Write a protein that binds this ligand. Sequence first.
Ligand SMILES: *C/C=C(C)/C=C/C=C(C)/C=C/C1=C(C)CCCC1(C)C
Ligand SMILES: *C/C=C(C)/C=C/C=C(C)/C=C/C1=C(C)CCCC1(C)C
Ligand SMILES: CCCCCCCCO[C@@H]1O[C@H](CO)[C@@H](O)[C@H](O)[C@H]1O
Ligand SMILES: CCCCCCCCO[C@@H]1O[C@H](CO)[C@@H](O)[C@H](O)[C@H]1O
Lengths: 225, 225, 60, 60
Amino acid sequence: MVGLTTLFWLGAIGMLVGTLAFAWAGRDAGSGERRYYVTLVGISGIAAVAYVVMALGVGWVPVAERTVFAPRYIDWILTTPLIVYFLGLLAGLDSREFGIVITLNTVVMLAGFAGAMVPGIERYALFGMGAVAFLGLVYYLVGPMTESASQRSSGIKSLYVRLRNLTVILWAIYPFIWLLGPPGVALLTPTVDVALIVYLDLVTKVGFGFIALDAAATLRAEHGE
Amino acid sequence: MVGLTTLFWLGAIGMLVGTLAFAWAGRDAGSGERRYYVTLVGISGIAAVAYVVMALGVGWVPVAERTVFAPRYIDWILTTPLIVYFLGLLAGLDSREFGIVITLNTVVMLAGFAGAMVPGIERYALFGMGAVAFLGLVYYLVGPMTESASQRSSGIKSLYVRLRNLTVILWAIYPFIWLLGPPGVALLTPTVDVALIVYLDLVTKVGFGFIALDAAATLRAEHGE
Amino acid sequence: GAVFIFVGALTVLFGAIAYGEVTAAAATGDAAAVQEAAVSAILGLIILLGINLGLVAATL
Amino acid sequence: GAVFIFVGALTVLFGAIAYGEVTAAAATGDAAAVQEAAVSAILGLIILLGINLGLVAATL
Ligand SMILES: *C/C=C(C)/C=C/C=C(C)/C=C/C1=C(C)CCCC1(C)C
Ligand SMILES: *C/C=C(C)/C=C/C=C(C)/C=C/C1=C(C)CCCC1(C)C
Ligand SMILES: CCCCCCCCO[C@@H]1O[C@H](CO)[C@@H](O)[C@H](O)[C@H]1O
Ligand SMILES: CCCCCCCCO[C@@H]1O[C@H](CO)[C@@H](O)[C@H](O)[C@H]1O
């Protein structure tokens, strides 16, 4: 009776482990690497809180014969822009460029949230808004931001590309789970939906962070350290 | 009503295509490559006949609340030893060594056939006989026969290894389908069982052949052609 | 590229076939019949993953 | 090696969870309930394949 809470607790544990790992890895980080470690801690830390809240049975919203989880979407709204921020830092973006990508990202996240809380075919119009904004975000990540990253060191460009590929490819799967899951046609049950998202969230946040952590030493060596 | 026959016809078509491709590819084969092309034609050709027979609804045996296909096992008994023969030719085996591997292979195939036609836990004893013989066959392919192949050209050794890996890895899956399928605990339905075997048979026979065909030109060049 | 497409396409094909069996069983109204078709589909998909993984490792 | 094991293990884990839902539905006796759990399992496994493939391509 309810392995849902079990899945949420597993997500919370995974995010917590990541949060602690990143925090520790950045204990003696330089003044240039600092923001990176702090950002990773924020990404996984907030996700950890969202999972704990859901595991405690809070934020469960039984929308029209379906079950949506408010904390999931709130988490996304607040964490995805930090992921974009991390990528933007590697690319070496200026305030303007950051504002563009963060705006697009927010449209995506807000669209999914609103659509999940909206009964009727109108939710598909909201989904469309998010889907289009997502394509714009992908364009910026693979285009303008990639060209910006190319002006950095080979190690930075290499890291940017690896994290960008992980992000683009895996983020592209979320809309399919939304459409096929409870928010959309509800072909996937809440349990299956939650299991898939727990897996994706851990990879896009914790996996994402570990890849960055694994590159840290090499990046320091590039500057003569 | 019966996509089973449809799956069998698809298997027949795939085997036929392979048979024709190999026959054509060996039209101008030398006196040294000849046996290889002829063997491939026999492997896929016999498999093609078995699939046509099953597609026509012949050889279907409704053993104790389960459905087994005699042509499938007859096919295996006659084609797997030709695959072993092909591998043995690449390895450069002598009559004695060929006899050893062909004996082991036959035990495997005969065990599966008998077990499939036998009701009761006794079929598991027959399965065991085949499983042990299979491990002996794997040993010969990865051990003695690999050392024998190492005495041939780099191209031959390379081809042997590629085909040996495909064989060992994929052949190892058949016993699991047997155990979980109709012959064993019957957790897999006839349709799912047949679909998985059609896929495996095409790869282990037609895929196997195409890999050899793709290496032909390089092997000729090795001898100064 | 072509391999991901190949295995992805086939997996979808297998799923469709599996889905067909589940739907047909459901039409009968027998929960037990549906469960048998469903278990077969799940196990079949897991095995299919094994085949695809083995194929990739053997070729790549 | 470790990646095949990882994705294979996870797929089996997902299958077990999916199987659990199908079994629970069957216990009710409602063929429709089982069909819903089964369709979810099939689609979920196909999506899981997508995730694993994407992960591999993004890292390897
Ligand atoms: C840890 C959470 C992450 C990285 C979440 C990423 C979520 C997305 C990329 C969601 C995208 C969506 C669309 C493109 C369309 C509208 C529906 C969404 C919100 C599921
Ligand atoms: C084209 C057909 C091929 C390559 C068939 C290969 C079949 C096997 C390797 C079957 C093996 C079996 C065992 C190891 C144990 C007993 C049951 C069998 C026959 C399924
Ligand atoms: C998660 C740990 C990975 C750290 C990767 C950070 C390496 C980036 O490199 C840093 O980028 C800064 C831009 O804000 C520059 O000011 C620094 O001089 C430069 O070393
Ligand atoms: C399917 C087409 C692939 C052909 C690969 C065959 C190349 C093997 O090479 C051949 O092996 C023979 C051993 O019987 C030798 O006698 C030949 O001299 C040698 O060229």
